[PDB]
Amino acid sequence: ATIEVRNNCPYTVWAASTPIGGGRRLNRGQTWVINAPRGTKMARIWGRTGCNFNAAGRGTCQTGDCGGVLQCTGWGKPPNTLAEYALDQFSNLDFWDISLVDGFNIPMTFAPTKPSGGKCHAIHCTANINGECPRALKVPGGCNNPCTTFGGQQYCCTQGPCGPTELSKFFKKRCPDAYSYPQDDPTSTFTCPGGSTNYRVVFCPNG
Ligand SMILES: [Cl-]
Numbered sequence: 410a411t412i413e414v415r416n417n418c419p420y421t422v423w424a425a426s427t428p429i430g431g432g433r434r435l436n437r438g439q440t441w442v443i444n445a446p447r448g449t450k451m452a453r454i455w456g457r458t459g460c461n462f463n464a465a466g467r468g469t470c471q472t473g474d475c476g477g478v479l480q481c482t483g484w485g486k487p488p489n490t491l492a493e494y495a496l497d498q499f500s501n502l503d504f505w506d507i508s509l510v511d512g513f514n515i516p517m518t519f520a521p522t523k524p525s526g527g528k529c530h531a532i533h534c535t536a537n538i539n540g541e542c543p544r545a546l547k548v549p550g551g552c553n554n555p556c557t558t559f560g561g562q563q564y565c566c567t568q569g570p571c572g573p574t575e576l577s578k579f580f581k582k583r584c585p586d587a588y589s590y591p592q593d594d595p596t597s598t599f600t601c602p603g604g605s606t607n608y609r610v611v612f613c614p615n616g
Contacts, residue, residue, distance in 0.1 A: 410496065411607040413522075414441040414454060418515065418613035423457035423470060423479070430454070431480035434462075435612075447603065450495040455485055456515045456612050458550045472514040472550040488512025488551030490534065492519050492610045501603045506532075508588040508597070509580045513538045514551035518614035522607040529601035535615050536583030543579060554580070556590065566591035 416422045416435035424433045429452070430443040445452060459471030466479035473489030475481035490513045494505035507519050513534070520531030542552035555576035556564035563574060571592055573581065581589035588597040 410445050410447065410604070411522075412443050412445055412454065412494075413607070413609045414443070415609065415611040416440075416456070416613070417611050417616055418456075419616070420458070421460075422515065422612050423460045423462075423473075424454065424612075425457055425473060425475055425481040425485055426452070426454045427481055427484065428452060431482070432466075432475070432478070434460075434479075445494075445496060447496050448498045450497070452494055452496075453484070454492040454610050455489045456517075457485065457489070458514060472548075485511075487557045488514045488548060488553045490515050490517055492517065494608070496603060498603075503601045503603050503606070503608075505599055505601075505608070506588060506597050507534050507584070507586065509534070509538075509584060510554055510556065510588050510591055510593075512551050512553045512557060513542075513580070515612050516614065518609075518611045520609050520611075521601050522609055523605060525601060525605060528599045529606065530599075532586040532599060533614060534584035534587045538580070538583055541583075543576065546576065554590070564590065 414424045422435050433441045457470040457473040462468035462479045469477050473485035475485045491508040516535040518533050524530045538552050546553045562568045577589040
């Protein structure tokens with residue numbers, strides 16, 4: 410239920426969190442701890458780079474912008490590396506993952522503060538994705554996922570079952586534990602017994 414967001418990047422990051430949390434400027438080394446009640450589903454945490462806000466919480470960001478506002482209520486504009494989770498009250502299990510479906514912008518580590526074996530352990534995505542990003546998907550500060558750039562069933566899996574693509578394999582290749590495309594569920598979903606642990610999301614785990 411407790412999620413700790415830590416910015417270990419050498420640059421400032423504007424953490425964002427829905428549906429609870431909002432937004433927060435995080436300078437190098439700063440942490441933000443938010444409480445997520447049991448039953449919180451379809452939640453996500455991400456970081457925003459190159460933002461420019463004025464006293465009122467209005468401005469714009471280079472990546473992951475959520476409507477030109479500091480405290481998000483909606484989703485960020487890709488590309489942005491995602492930390493998704495659902496604290497299910499029915500199975501009493503925590504379902505979480507790192508997703509690249511909406512792109513990549515900042516490397517991160519998603520981990521249980523109390524790993525208990527099985528699929529309940531830290532996962533990472535620290536590859537140099539922005540650096541090796543295919544030219545067709547590359548944007549300032551990030552690397553978009555083929556579904557965002559090209560669209561269509563092939564990449565977005567909007568019409569029905571889909572499979573990996575050469576462009577999706579570019580991400581899975583570099584971050585095996587993360588979602589490379591919409592239906593990359595089997596090797597991208599992790600769980601922990603609900604109530605048995607807390608969570609930590611850190612930007613630039615390798616500094
Ligand atoms: Cl709670």
